[PDB]
Structures are given as structure tokens and as C-alpha cells.
């Protein structure tokens, strides 16, 4: 049910305060004009670094994890509509949420309340970014029911949570009583070139990879580029594979006689041998745990 | 909390917990004569009294005492590829002090263990607590323990990571504020951030979850107070 | 397949001298270190003292040292021991044996065979 | 006695897990690797375990071991009549750079 992004997805990236200014920037955000799945039953769906959700008073909170049961670490952002409440808990699966959605409060790890979120069409980005899950959204007046509307709008951060869980799949929850439509888009490491406005806000942004014409604007630091040749960057040919030839020979080089000896020459007079013309494992050396000083120069062991 | 502990996790899954919202008196740690190896990367002991951070990590742990050399950016070896290995970019301090005396043994406690066969050695704070059995179901499986009894003194590690520029601050050690002036020019310490200048009222609209503003060229512009 | 060889019987009145003898056969003889371990009757083995046939190094346990003199013959692959004097108590199964003695990179200690015999 | 320490001997239906300890100081099984071996009356002692836990081959998975601290431990299942020996525990001690052996244990089967 695919439907195209326009310039939703954009959100301050941190809170140094900027005015007026074209500060670029290379973060996590919604690629734009991008294809997302308008989904109206409720299945399980990657995470993929962090995903865009927007909705148009009924729907209720969401649900992230590894494998959404008791196994593994789970994430639960119940929604009140008096309380934001979130539990790291390791609930049991519930193929279906109803609060019939709870299925155990188990190994209780982390918990959370603050003031409830809350036609129209609210929109929400989640990332999880080292350690921290990032959750941003703003509220806006819609009508066109149909399609994604068309226009700009940056999303403030509500919270950061110190959680620091592996999420690779996720759903939305809702107690039931066809259902309400919602999207999602999936986020990418985009460059973006971002237009603060005289107070601050964010008005407008431009994706410095969609497009050429985006490219000589980013690379110019302006919205707007006169007539001209502009060099925006440099193309080459990626590698197509990777060939490796080494010679024929399959002698295996002798270390265990350098090694099991059990004879070591004085100091005064030090041993030594040459090696040569043969295959030479050294992953022997360097994995083994028997060796107290193991210290290489010039060469880093692990690529020998 | 974090140090008298009678429980240090094996080195093979190192505990962590998270400190915030709170004083932090640091003068405790470095001008005690207890603590083995003081080694701070990045900051400077005699200093952590005056700066204030986002998140303090304080993962504990023990191990060989010869290897208390593997917890430093950039060292290798078997405890430093295969079970923790700290970032190239500064973890905070290092504290160590050699604990024979309680978690050793009459004999081998084998409870302290640590892998020596991980495949794919670990990124920057991964917590691998798998058991897969390495190749040669029969064999050898990851973790080894370690027996206890100089070089084999159990040594108990406790490792500060500062988590610095995230946020808003919120650990800050022992420093009397003092009320602020304006339109003098001032050495002033708003939160960390150390300067000189003016301090006028400002019309800039912040939001709430701003806490300053550079025009260019980390020129920090402007600052909410901190109270 | 390895073997090792020992003389036949042998008894002995005290206040003589020994050389038993010990041959090896079917592996490179002058690369393990071959020595000597002693068990008595109703007793238990007791460990005795060894030397690398590869350049005449010897190891000797205290509780035999200066007892027992225990040197090789790498020309034909035989090693013998040498006393001072028999003492009746003396009286045992001796035995020769090759053992792993090797750093392969961590340290190991071994037995292979013996299959041998002796007494005095 | 010995610089290890053994049992003088046990017994135990056929059937049964058996495990004997043999006990000595930490200057050599500490840190050195323990081996144990089977000896038949009348029949030259062979090698049965090695340096830690570990059978050579042509002797049965029945068999294994465990060092801990300054002793071992050696353990047998599926225990038969014919099983019925002597064994001992040796390992090159380090500070007299000599090697010794334990005591010795008198495995008999009961029957």
C-alpha cells in the first residue's frame, strides 16, 4: 500500500541552538520521497536502525524486541491516555495485544512514567542510537485521509531512554473493542542540509543525496544556486570482485622444529633459522593461550 | 555501592550500572592509598571535581593481576579481544586493587571465568554471554574458568567511562555555586561550560529541551543557567 | 609401532655393581627423552630419573640422585643405567620408558610405553 | 608417604560411577598437568589419562578426570570386573624439576 514520503521525518538532531543558519549535518533521518507501507491486522516488522510511524484518539502504544518474549530483552511503551508508561520487563509473546496486551511482568529491568502523548496526525521517529532510544514526535492538522500530506514539519525529542536493547522486530499494540490506517518509513544515513529559521526552527531541509540538483546545493551550503556549472563530486567505478593469486606451492612451513625444540642455544650465541617456500599458518601462534609476551612490530598479528 | 560490593561479576559477562542526578565527590577515589593502579585516559585526576557529565558507567570486574595491563585503550591480548575491550576514544579511569583476600580461595574458585575462543573478538562494550563451543558439542567450549590462591592474585577492576557531550548534565562533583552577575565580565562556569565574557538577558527563543546556542565556529553564543 | 626392550631376568648378591639395559625400536630415537621409574612389589612406581639421548642431558630426582648414573648409547639407540652397590631391598621391577617431554607452546608431560622387567 | 597423596584403595558394583582423588601440593599439580595410568598385576603399567581430562585412543570414553587446585581426580563409568587394576597419578613436579608419582589405588570390583 505504498505511498511516497514527501519531507516528513525531520527532527532536530541535538539542542545547541541555531539561527539562521544552513548547518548541515549527517544523521539518521527518513530518506526523502521514499516508499512506505501504508498498513490498515497488525504483523511484526524490522526495526532497521529506527522507523518513521505516523497515525491520523485511538491507537495505542507500541511494542520492540529481539523476539518479543520472555527470552530475550524486551522494550514496552504502553500508552495511558493519562501516563506514558514503558517497561523493559520481559513479558511473554502475545501474538495478539488486547489490558489483555500484558502478558507477564517478568525480570522487571527498567521502567518509566511521565504525561500521556495523546482529523489530525501525530508522527513519531524511535531509534535506538549507543545505548539510547531516542523517541521524537509532533501533532499537526490534517485532512487528506487518503495520501501522506504534502508540506514540512520538524519533530522535537520527547525522551531518551538509557536502555540499550537489540530491537530487530516490532508492532503496534491495541486493546480491541478494517481497523485505523498508519505508515511507516524506515530511517537511513542520510547528509542533510538543514535551514533554521530566525527563531530556531527548523523550516526547511534539503537531502544532499536524492538528487544532483540537491548535490551543488548542499555542496554550496544554500537552498538556491545560480545559473552555471557547479562540480559537485567525483564518480568512480565500483569493484565488480575480488581476485587473489598466490603461487602453487603447499609445503607447510616447519614451525613446530622452531618451536618443540628442545634445545635453545645460548644467548651468546642465538640460534637461527631461514624459512622459506612454503605455507605458513600463523593463526598456530597467535590464537594460542600458552605464549606470555606475544608483541608484534610493524606488522599487527591478526593479519599475518 | 559500586566498590564495597562483595560480588564482582566474571570478567566473561562484566557488570555495568549507570550513575545520575547526583554529587559526585571524586576525592575519595584518588587520594586514597587503597587502589593499586590509578590511570585516568582523557581527563585528569586531580580535576574530576570540576567538571560535570551526562552519564557515568562503572563496569566491575575481576581478573589475573598480570593481566590488569590488557584495560587500556588500545592493548591487546586475551582478556582485551575476547571479553572487554575499551574504545580507541578515553574511558574515564581505571581503578584496580588486588582482592586475593576475599574472592580467591583455599583452593581454585572457578567461578571467575572468561572465554578464550571467541570467534569474531568483540567491538567497543559487548557483552557476549554466548557458549557455542568453538571447534576443534565436544569441543572446546569458550569460557575457561581462572583458579585462585603474584601474578595470579585475583585483581578486582572497576572502570569509570565518563559519557561526555550527550546532553543537558547531570553528574557534577562537589563546586559551591555561587549567585550570577551580569554586564561584568566574568570567568564564569555555567554547567562546565568555561569561559569569560558579558552576560546579558536574552530575547532568543529556546525551546525546552535546548541548553545553548553556537553561531558558528563553536562560538557558544548563548546559555540557560543551569537553575 | 614403538617398542622398547629390556634384559632378561636378573638377580644379583648386594655389594655389586648394575647396567640394565633398555633398546628402542620403530620411532627416531634421538628426539623424546627416555628414563627409568621404579616399581616394587605390593608397591607403588616411584619415579626415577631421565636423559635426552639427543646430547646426553640428564634429569635426576633427588631421591636418586648420585644412586643411579643413567647415560645412553645413541649409536645403536640403548640406554643402561650404572650403580655403586646393590642393596638387598633393592629388590623391584624396575622399568625404562619414553614420555613426552616436550613445550609444544603449553607445557606437557607424558608416558607412552614401557613394557619391560626387572629385579636383583 | 608420597608427595602426592592417594587412596589405598575402594570398591564398587559393576555399574556404578566411581571417581578416586589423589592430593599433593601445589608446586607442581597446581600449575603442572596431571596424568594417571592403569596397571594389571602382572601387566606393565599404560597410559590412561593425560595432561588434564584426556584419553589417548584405543582406551574407552568412559574414562575421564578433572584437576582441581593441588589434586585430580579420576573417574570411571560403566564400571566391569575386568577393570579391576591398580592407579596411579604422576605429573613432573616443578620446584625439584624431578617428576613423581602418587601412592596408588587398589581398584577392585565388587563380585
Known amino acids: 500500500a505504498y505511498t511516497n514520503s514527501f519531507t516528513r521525518g525531520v527532527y532536530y538532531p541535538d539542542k545547541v541552538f541555531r539561527s539562521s543558519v544552513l548547518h548541515s549535518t549527517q544523521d539518521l533521518f527518513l530518506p526523502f520521497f521514499s516508499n512506505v507501507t501504508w498498513f490498515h491486522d497488525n504483523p511484526v516488522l524490522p526495526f532497521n536502525d529506527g522507523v518513521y510511524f505516523a497515525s491520523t484518539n485511538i491507537i495505542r502504544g507500541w511494542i520492540f524486541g529481539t523476539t518479543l518474549d520472555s527470552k530475550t530483552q524486551s522494550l514496552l511503551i504502553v500508552n495511558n491516555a493519562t501516563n506514558v508508561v514503558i517497561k523493559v520487563c520481559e513479558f511473554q509473546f502475545c501474538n495478539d495485544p488486547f489490558f489483555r496486551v500484558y502478558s507477564s511482568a517478568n525480570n522487571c529491568t527498567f521502567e518509566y512514567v511521565s504525561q500521556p502523548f495523546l482529523k489530525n496526525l501525530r508522527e513519531f521517529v524511535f531509534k535506538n542510537i549507543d545505548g539510547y532510544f531516542k523517541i521524537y514526535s509532533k501533532h499537526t492538522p490534517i485532512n487528506l485521509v487518503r495520501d501522506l500530506p504534502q508540506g514540512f514539519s520538524a519533530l522535537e525529542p520527547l525522551v531518551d531512554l538509557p536502555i540499550g536493547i537489540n530491537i530487530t522486530r516490532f508492532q503496534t499494540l491495541l486493546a480491541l473493542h478494517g481497523a485505523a490506517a498508519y505508515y511507516v518509513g524506515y530511517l537511513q544515513p542520510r547528509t542533510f542540509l538543514l535551514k533554521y529559521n530566525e527563531n530556531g526552527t527548523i523550516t526547511d531541509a534539503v537531502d544532499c543525496a536524492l538528487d544532483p540538483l540537491s548535490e551543488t546545493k548542499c555542496t554550496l551550503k544554500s537552498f538556491t544556486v545560480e545559473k552555471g556549472i557547479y562540480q559537485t563530486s567525483n564518480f568512480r567505478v565500483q569493484p565488480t570482485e575480488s581476485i587473489v593469486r598466490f603461487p602453487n606451492i603447499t609445503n607447510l612451513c616447519p614451525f613446530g622444529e622452531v618451536f618443540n625444540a628442545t634445545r635453545f642455544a645460548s644467548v651468546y650465541a642465538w640460534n637461527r633459522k631461514r624459512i622459506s617456500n612454503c605455507v605458513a599458518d600463523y593463526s598456530v601462534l597467535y590464537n594460542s593461550a600458552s605464549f606470555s609476551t606475544f608483541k608484534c612490530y610493524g606488522v599487527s598479528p591478526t593479519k599475518l | 555501592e559500586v566498590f564495597n560490593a562483595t560480588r564482582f561479576a566474571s570478567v566473561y559477562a562484566w557488570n555495568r550500572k549507570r550513575i545520575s542526578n547526583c554529587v559526585a565527590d571524586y576525592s575519595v577515589l584518588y587520594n586514597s592509598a587503597s587502589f593499586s593502579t590509578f590511570k585516568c585516559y582523557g581527563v585528569s585526576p586531580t580535576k574530576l571535581n570540576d567538571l560535570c557529565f551526562t552519564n557515568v558507567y562503572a563496569d566491575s570486574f575481576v581478573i589475573r593481576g598480570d593481566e590488569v595491563r590488557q584495560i587500556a585503550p588500545g592493548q591487546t591480548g586475551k582478556i582485551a579481544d575476547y571479553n572487554y575491550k575499551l574504545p580507541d576514544d578515553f574511558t574515564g579511569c581505571v581503578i584496580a586493587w588486588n582482592s586475593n583476600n576475599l574472592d580467591s580461595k583455599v583452593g581454585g574458585n572457578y567461578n571467575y571465568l572468561y572465554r578464550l575462543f571467541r570467534k569474531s573478538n568483540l567491538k567497543p562494550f559487548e557483552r557476549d554471554i554466548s557458549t557455542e563451543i568453538y571447534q576443534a558439542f565436544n569441543c572446546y567450549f569458550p569460557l575457561q574458568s581462572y583458579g585462585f590462591q603474584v601474578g595470579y592474585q585475583p585483581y578486582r577492576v572497576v572502570v569509570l567511562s565518563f559519557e561526555l557531550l550527550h546532553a543537558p548534565a547531570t553528574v557534577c562533583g562537589p563546586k559551591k555555586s555561587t549567585n550570577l552577575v551580569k554586564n561584568k565580565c566574568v570567568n564564569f562556569n555555567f554547567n562546565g561550560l568555561t569561559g569569560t565574557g558579558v552576560l546579558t538577558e536574552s530575547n532568543k527563543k529556546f525551546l525546552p529541551f535546548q541548553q545553548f546556542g553556537r553561531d558558528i565556529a563553536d562560538t557558544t553564543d548563548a546559555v540557560r543557567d543551569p537553575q | 609401532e614403538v617398542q622398547l626392550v629390556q634384559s632378561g631376568a636378573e638377580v644379583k648378591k648386594p655389594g655389586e655393581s648394575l647396567k640394565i639395559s633398555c633398546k628402542g625400536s620403530?620411532?627416531?630415537?634421538?628426539?623424546?627423552?627416555i628414563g627409568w621409574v621404579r616399581h616394587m612389589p605390593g608397591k607403588g612406581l616411584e619415579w626415577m630419573g631421565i636423559?635426552?639421548?639427543?646430547?646426553?642431558?640428564?634429569r635426576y630426582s633427588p631421591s636418586f640422585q648420585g644412586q643411579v648414573t643413567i647415560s645412553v648409547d645413541t649409536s645403536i639407540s640403548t640406554a643402561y643405567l650404572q650403580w655403586s652397590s646393590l642393596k638387598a631391598s633393592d629388590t623391584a621391577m624396575y622399568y625404562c620408558?619414553?614420555?613426552?617431554?616436550?613445550?609444544?607452546?603449553?607445557?606437557?608431560?607424558?608416558?607412552?610405553?614401557?613394557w619391560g622387567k626387572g629385579t636383583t | 608417604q608420597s608427595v602426592l597423596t592417594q587412596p589405598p584403595s575402594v570398591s564398587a558394583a559393576p555399574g556404578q560411577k566411581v571417581t578416586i582423588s589423589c592430593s599433593g601440593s601445589?608446586?607442581?599439580?597446581?600449575?603442572?598437568?596431571v596424568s594417571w595410568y592403569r596397571q594389571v598385576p602382572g601387566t606393565a603399567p599404560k597410559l590412561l589419562i593425560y595432561?588434564?581430562?584426556k584419553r589417548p585412543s584405543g582406551i574407552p570414553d568412559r574414562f575421564s578426570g578433572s584437576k582441581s587446585g593441588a589434586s585430580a581426580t579420576l573417574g570411571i563409568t560403566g564400571l566391569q570386573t575386568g577393570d579391576e587394576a591398580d592407579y596411579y597419578c604422576?605429573?613432573?613436579?616443578?620446584?625439584?624439576?624431578?617428576?613423581?608419582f602418587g601412592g596408588g589405588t587398589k581398584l577392585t570390583v565388587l563380585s
Open positions: 595432561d588434564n581430562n
Open positions: 604422576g605429573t613432573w613436579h616443578t620446584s625439584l624439576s624431578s617428576g613423581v
Open positions: 620408558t619414553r614420555h613426552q617431554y616436550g613445550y609444544n607452546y603449553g607445557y606437557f608431560y607424558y608416558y607412552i610405553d614401557v
Open positions: 636423559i635426552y639421548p639427543g646430547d646426553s642431558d640428564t
Open positions: 620403530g620411532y627416531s630415537f634421538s628426539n623424546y627423552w
Open positions: 601445589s608446586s607442581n599439580i597446581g600449575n603442572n598437568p
